[PDB]
């Protein structure tokens, strides 16, 4: 292509913005009062285009800020002041909705400003300007903000105690969030902090009231309360609130006085002899969220197990003693299999206690070796008790005494063959399993050698 262009006779040197402004300001006034049915959008946008070419967008800017703030000073501020105690919040949300639709229309008809002034001069958009001017004029008034906060706080308390409106509090919550532009600063400083603090006070009062001298009812109703709180927050309040509230709940409702509710004489850990799966399971599952919470239940469990081992091991009939050892072991592992979720820390503390008292008595190994001797004096069931019997062996640190006695008993259970089944007599070695085995096998396998 070898054609000249030379086709740019363009000039916008016409000073009449005053006229295009006064008209645009009348248009904004009409939109503020909801008379949009009779304004020519194309002509309104044309007025907007001319000012952009004339570079009088600043006049439109300052003028737009002035007109929106004037409409907010008059016919919004005292519009909600005059209803401060009468049908409040609803009027605030209504005014907010009308303002939102008005600013949507204003951005729609002045959209050029949002494309070459707002973008190229590092200033807030028309929609964001409306949101900011609402946040600075209607809310954070000093009287509107105080009343708005109290109404939300009082309503959420009556709901916590009565039935109140849930749609309005949700609308206000959403308005407070969207008033923070991208963030939630308005939410944080307007409703989040007072609601959190009043909830802390209410839950501390409830904490002092709940302690009434019961555990199962207390823990179940605390579960009901926290479930109610999370349900309410997900229903009415906004989602980002659901994290800090629940934490505060578990900071004030149970972890505030966790140590005094684990043990109380009249009601769950103290009397675990009931053996109810739900009774301890609910208490565990409700103390699981609190950090360090597992430690106090572990300590109570450990104290009880220590006392039981001291009481039972301290001599006594040779077989009923080991029967007590195994039956207590079975009962205690029952809890960890059906009450808890087989928590590693709990298993560790039971193992530690079992390693404490079982080895505390020096006769234990002798009794453990006798167990088999009494046992050897259905066959599948006997195999099952071997697994339970093999559990203690791992716990003993003095297995030398056990194997030495087991070898002494090995002779007594061999020479006259007190063992009912010979084939199993190898199986217990297989469970027990060289010197731990050969010395127990040298005597027996000799009786196999001389049997030919």
């Amino acid at each position: 292509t070898k054609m000249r262009i030379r086709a740019f006779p363009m000039t916008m040197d016409e000073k009449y913005v005053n006229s295009i402004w006064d008209l645009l300001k009348n248009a904004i006034q009409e939109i503020q009062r909801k008379n949009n049915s009779g304004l020519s959008f194309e002509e309104l946008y044309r007025n907007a285009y001319t000012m952009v070419l004339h570079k009088h967008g600043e006049k439109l800017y300052t003028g737009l800020r002035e007109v929106v703030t004037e409409h907010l000073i008059n016919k919004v501020r005292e519009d909600v002041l005059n209803s401060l105690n009468n049908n409040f919040l609803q009027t605030l949300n209504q005014a907010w909705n009308d303002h939102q639709t008005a600013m949507v229309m204003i951005r729609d008809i002045l959209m050029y400003m949002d494309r070459v002034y707002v973008q190229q001069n590092n200033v807030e958009n028309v929609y964001n300007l409306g949101l900011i001017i609402f946040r600075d004029q209607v809310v954070r008034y000093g009287c509107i903000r105080d009343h708005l906060r109290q109404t939300l706080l009082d309503m959420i308390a009556r709901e916590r105690k009565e039935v109140v409106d849930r749609g309005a509090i949700r609308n206000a919550c959403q308005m407070l969030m969207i008033l923070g532009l991208e963030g939630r600063s308005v939410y944080e400083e307007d409703f989040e902090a007072p609601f959190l603090e009043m909830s802390a006070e209410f839950f501390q009062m409830e904490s002092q009231k709940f302690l009434e001298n019961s555990a199962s009812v207390y823990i179940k109703k605390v579960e009901a309360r926290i479930n109610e709180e999370i349900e309410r927050v997900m229903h009415c309040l906004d989602k980002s609130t659901e994290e800090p509230i629940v934490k505060v709940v578990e900071r004030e409702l149970i972890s505030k006085h966790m140590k005094t509710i684990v043990e109380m004489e009249n009601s769950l850990v103290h009397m675990l002899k009931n053996g109810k799966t739900e009774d301890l399971g609910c208490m565990y599952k409700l103390f699981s969220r609190v950090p360090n919470g597992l430690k106090t239940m572990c300590e109570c469990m450990s104290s009880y197990l220590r006392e039981q081992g001291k009481a039972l091991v301290s001599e006594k009939n040779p077989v009923d003693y080991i029967q007590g050892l195994l039956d207590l072991k079975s009962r205690f592992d029952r809890f960890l299999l059906e009450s808890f979720n087989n928590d590693r820390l709990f298993k560790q503390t039971i193992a530690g206690d079992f390693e404490y008292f079982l080895n505390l008595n020096s006769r234990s190994p002798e009794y453990l070796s006798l167990f088999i001797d009494d046992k050897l004096k259905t066959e599948q069931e006997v195999e099952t008790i071997l697994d339970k019997a093999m559990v203690l062996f791992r716990f003993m640190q003095e297995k030398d005494v056990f194997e030495r006695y087991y070898k002494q008993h090995l002779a007594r259970r061999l020479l006259t063959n007190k063992s009912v089944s010979d084939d199993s007599e190898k199986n217990m070695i297989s469970k027990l399993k060289c010197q731990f085995t050969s010395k127990l096998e040298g005597m027996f396998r000799d009786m196999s050698i001389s049997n030919t």
């Binding site: 292509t1 054609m3 000249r4 262009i5 030379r6 086709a7 740019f8 363009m10 916008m12 949009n36 049915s37 009779g38 304004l39 020519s40 959008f41 194309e42 002509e43 309104l44 946008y45 044309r46 285009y49 952009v52 070419l53 229309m105 729609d108 008809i109 959209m111 050029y112 494309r115 070459v116 190229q120």
Partner: protein, 154 residues
């Protein structure tokens, strides 16, 4: 589940709309640009650009009006922009520029702005003063810095 997304459907719909326009049936909005009537689909001409969005769906008086007034633009430019909206193809020649550029600045469609900027890029050292004047008036950053780079290359 696994939702299935088809890519060819959008262009298929565009060709279907083009065929519908060519058949000239189901027209709803008619624009008078400079005394010349151009007919177009209201909803199609409502999702193309923000200006038309605030026009056919803003809520102003312009809704309940069959005939609308589109001034400050040239009939050739309006036909060109409607053609772009209807088939995503912009035929740019020497004649249809500086009226397509002002119309594109009007309707605030970034695609037409970029296409016009490229066209003036191709045909840009004899008439740079008036092009710079136009770019400064309509405030296109890309055109300005490309013009500065071209001056640097000079």
């Amino acid at each position: 589940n696994n939702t299935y997304r088809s890519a060819q459907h959008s262009q298929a719909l565009l060709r279907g709309l083009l065929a519908l326009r060519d058949s000239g049936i189901l027209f709803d909005v008619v624009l008078v640009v400079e005394g010349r009537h151009i007919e177009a689909h209201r909803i199609l001409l409502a999702a193309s650009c923000d200006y038309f969005r605030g026009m056919f769906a803003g809520g102003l008086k312009e809704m309940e009006q069959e005939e609308v007034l589109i001034h400050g633009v040239s009939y050739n430019a309006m036909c060109q922009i409607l053609h772009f909206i209807y088939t995503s193809e912009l035929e740019l020649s020497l004649s249809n520029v500086q009226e397509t550029l002002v119309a594109a600045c009007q309707l605030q469609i970034p695609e037409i702005i970029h296409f016009c900027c490229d066209f003036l890029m191709s045909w840009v050292e004899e008439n740079i003063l008036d092009v710079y004047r136009l770019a400064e008036l309509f405030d296109l950053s890309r055109l300005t810095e490309q013009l500065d780079t071209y001056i640097l290359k000079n």
